[PDB]
Each structure stands twice: as structure tokens, then as C-alpha cells.
Scaffold this active site. Structure first.
Site, PDB file in Angstrom:
ATOM      1  N   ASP A 142     -16.193 -10.824  -2.211  1.00  0.00           N
ATOM      2  CA  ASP A 142     -17.158 -10.874  -1.094  1.00  0.00           C
ATOM      3  C   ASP A 142     -16.443 -11.344   0.163  1.00  0.00           C
ATOM      4  O   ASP A 142     -16.339 -12.566   0.346  1.00  0.00           O
ATOM      5  CB  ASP A 142     -18.303 -11.807  -1.452  1.00  0.00           C
ATOM      6  CG  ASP A 142     -19.348 -11.963  -0.363  1.00  0.00           C
ATOM      7  OD1 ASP A 142     -19.336 -11.160   0.606  1.00  0.00           O
ATOM      8  OD2 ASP A 142     -20.179 -12.861  -0.529  1.00  0.00           O
ATOM      9  N   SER A 190     -16.210  -2.525  16.753  1.00  0.00           N
ATOM     10  CA  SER A 190     -16.068  -1.077  16.704  1.00  0.00           C
ATOM     11  C   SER A 190     -16.209  -0.506  18.114  1.00  0.00           C
ATOM     12  O   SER A 190     -16.963  -1.044  18.912  1.00  0.00           O
ATOM     13  CB  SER A 190     -17.109  -0.470  15.724  1.00  0.00           C
ATOM     14  OG  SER A 190     -17.162   0.903  15.775  1.00  0.00           O
TER      15      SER A 190
HETATM   16  C1  LIG Z   1     -27.039  -8.555  -5.957  1.00  0.00           C
HETATM   17  N1  LIG Z   1     -26.790  -9.989  -6.364  1.00  0.00           N
HETATM   18  C2  LIG Z   1     -25.979 -10.798  -5.381  1.00  0.00           C
HETATM   19  C3  LIG Z   1     -24.554 -10.279  -5.435  1.00  0.00           C
HETATM   20  C4  LIG Z   1     -23.731 -11.076  -4.468  1.00  0.00           C
HETATM   21  C5  LIG Z   1     -24.223 -10.802  -3.066  1.00  0.00           C
HETATM   22  C6  LIG Z   1     -23.210 -11.379  -2.059  1.00  0.00           C
HETATM   23  F1  LIG Z   1     -21.994 -10.817  -2.211  1.00  0.00           F
HETATM   24  F2  LIG Z   1     -23.529 -11.263  -0.761  1.00  0.00           F
HETATM   25  F3  LIG Z   1     -22.987 -12.690  -2.217  1.00  0.00           F
HETATM   26  C7  LIG Z   1     -25.584 -11.413  -2.864  1.00  0.00           C
HETATM   27  C8  LIG Z   1     -26.573 -10.826  -3.898  1.00  0.00           C
END
Ligand SMILES: CN[C@H]1CC[C@H](C(F)(F)F)CC1
Length: 330
Positions: free
Chosen positions: A35, A199
Site C-alpha cells: 500500500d 499530472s
Molecule cells: C479491502 N480491504 C482493505 C484492504 C486495504 C486497503 C488499504 F490498502 F487502503 F489499506 C483498505 C481496505
């Protein structure tokens, strides 16, 4: 050093991607959602409230000979989709694709929100935004990338997400076979702790390119592309029967449509998102209304270049002293 790991869509829509991560000694392999929009590495664990675990793989620190409680440390995070998790903290050995960090903060969940329980495919998150967003208290912790950086051959990682197919996260090197043409680099602001960039504009289908600055974040942990309402209205106006639905919570379109492509600018370069990438399928099983992959960022307070955008590119997260982003076609 380098590492290289395959990332795999969790479902047929590419709602998210999971990447295997080795934690502890002997290794416990969990499938984490990498992430670039957050900075905590947290896992489902032996400490997670039993009723909040439904099919995830758990980390058990008591079975790792390298795990150490980080005394007094807690964490608590809320995401953009309203999901949340919290708990306590261990340090342990964490490996991704052959790249090993010792003493990584592994945030062990005591509580997770319903959306995390209900998704059996995600065993936790590995944050790759800047460590200034890390939620550990009272001593903020570093990301896996920040801990690895000094050891890497080059202080970079790359995201190469697939469309309805696996892709790759690389650490410490740029695979020159993984993209076409050249990589265009663009400035990053770290002021909000994100990979935030501007962008240079957009085009809808075969339409003319509109030169306009769009500030947003490169966020692998967001599924969709969230842009200003003007841009999004211009896109969906090209799809017969598309509308913004207050009841569904965004733009929907007839599942019988063929969607136009969407182009975004990176400096003088252009990344083309094919129309098919913008189809997120029926709003409910058997519906002929389909959910759009380009949505308004109005009320979110930031534009988000999520997976819909990033999966059209080979993306370089350059963690040099002055960070930059790179985008190539592929
Ligand atoms: C769909 N479940 C979660 C998965 C991780 C997401 C994030 F990466 F943003 F943290 C949030 C929802």
C-alpha cells in the site's frame, strides 16, 4: 541487495493485490496488500479477536524465535474506505522476494474492522508511503522500504501491476525489460507523507489532450482512479447511459457499453488506461448496471491515482534523498 516478488489480484476485478511476505523464524508466509498510500506493516495474528478472523492466515509471534515485543508500543489506523485496525507491536525478520530486513516493526492486530474480517484473501497491509505517516506510538516506526533502503543496490522500488493477471514488486533495481520506451520522472511532494505528484492533464478516448495540473497520490492500496468532478464528468459523458448514482455511491454505466480509454499526462509523456480497465462489473450479482473505475475525488480532499491508473504503467518509486516518481508505458 534486491528483492522481487509477484503480486496477484485477489479476485476477478483486481479489487486489490496480494504479495507473499515471510515473517519470523522459521518463516510464516502471509499475503499482504502492498500500500503506497500508508506506512504501517500490520498483520492478522494470534492476538486478533477470534470473532474478527475468518479465513486469514495469522502471524503467531510466540512461534518466531526472532520476534521481540516492542514494549509499550501500540498502533491504530483508519483508511479512506472507513476500514480500521489497531493493536500492539513486535520487531521481527521480514523478507519480500529474497530481500530481508531484521528488526522490522510488525504491527499485530488486536482489532480489525468488518471489511478486513470479511476479506479472507488479505492477511494484512505492508505500507510503502513515507514513514512520517506510521501510526506506532509512542515511538514511530519505519517502513520496510525505509529499513531496506541503505542495503539496496539503488534506493527504489517498482510497481508493475497486472490487468486481470499477476504483476511484480521489485526492490533495489529497475527491470529494463518490464516496460516500453523511456521512464518519465516527475517531482514528488512528501509534505502529506504520500507519493504526491502533479499530472499534466488528460484525454478521454481519441479526444484532444487537456493540459491541466492534477495534484494526486500514487496509491497501490486504492482500487480506483479518483479525479476532480470536472474530469470524471467529461469521461462518463462519452458513455451512453452512464450516470452518477447517489444510491450506489458513484458513476455506474450499462454493462453492455464499450468504454473509452483514459489518458493521463506525466510531464510531456502520456499513459493510456484501456477502457476495459475502467469496468468493475455488475453493481450486484446479475445486474446490468456496472460500476465505473473512474470516480470523483470530491469530498475525499485529494486525487488518487489508484490501481486503475497504476496498472497501465511501470511505476518507479524513487526514494533518493529527493524522492521522485517515474512512469513508463508497458
Ligand atoms: C479491502 N480491504 C482493505 C484492504 C486495504 C486497503 C488499504 F490498502 F487502503 F489499506 C483498505 C481496505
Amino acid at each position: 541487495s534486491t528483492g522481487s516478488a509477484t503480486t496477484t489480484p485477489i479476485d476477478s476485478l483486481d479489487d486489490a493485490y496480494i504479495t507473499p511476505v515471510q515473517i519470523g523464524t522459521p518463516a510464516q508466509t502471509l499475503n499482504l496488500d502492498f500500500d503506497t498510500g500508508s506506512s504501517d506493516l500490520w498483520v492478522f495474528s494470534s492476538e486478533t479477536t477470534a470473532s474478527e478472523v475468518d479465513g486469514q492466515t495469522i502471524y503467531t509471534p510466540s512461534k518466531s524465535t526472532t520476534a521481540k515485543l516492542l514494549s509499550g508500543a501500540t498502533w491504530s489506523i483508519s483508511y479512506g474506505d472507513g476500514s480500521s485496525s489497531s493493536g500492539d507491536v513486535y520487531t521481527d525478520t521480514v523478507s519480500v522476494g529474497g530481500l530481508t530486513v531484521t528488526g522490522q516493526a510488525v504491527e499485530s492486530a488486536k482489532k480489525v474492522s468488518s471489511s478486513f474480517t470479511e476479506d479472507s484473501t488479505i492477511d494484512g497491509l505492508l505500507g510503502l508511503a513515507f514513514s512520517t505517516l506510521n501510526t506506532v506510538s509512542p515511538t514511530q516506526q519505519k517502513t520496510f522500504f525505509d529499513n531496506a533502503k541503505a542495503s539496496l543496490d539503488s534506493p527504489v522500488f517498482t510497481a508493475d501491476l497486472g490487468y486481470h493477471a499477476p504483476g511484480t514488486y521489485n526492490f533495489g533495481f529497475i527491470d529494463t525489460t518490464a516496460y516500453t520506451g523511456s521512464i518519465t520522472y516527475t517531482a514528488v511532494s512528501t509534505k502529506q507523507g504520500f507519493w504526491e505528484w502533479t499530472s499534466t492533464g488528460y484525454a478521454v478516448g481519441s479526444g484532444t489532450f487537456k493540459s491541466t495540473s492534477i495534484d494526486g497520490i500514487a496509491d497501490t492500496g486504492t482500487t480506483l482512479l479518483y479525479l476532480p468532478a470536472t474530469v470524471v464528468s467529461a469521461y462518463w459523458a462519452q458513455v451512453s447511459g452512464a450516470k452518477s448514482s447517489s444510491s450506489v455511491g458513484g458513476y455506474v454505466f450499462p454493462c453492455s457499453a464499450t468504454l473509452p480509454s483514459f489518458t493521463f499526462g506525466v510531464g510531456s509523456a502520456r499513459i493510456v488506461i484501456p477502457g476495459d480497465y475502467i469496468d468493475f462489473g455488475p453493481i450486484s450479482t446479475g445486474s446490468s448496471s456496472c460500476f465505473g473505475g473512474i470516480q470523483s475525488s470530491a469530498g475525499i480532499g485529494i486525487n488518487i491515482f489508484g490501481d486503475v491508473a497504476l496498472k497501465a504503467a511501470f511505476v518507479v518509486f524513487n526514494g533518493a534523498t529527493t524522492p521522485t516518481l517515474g512512469f513508463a508505458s508497458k
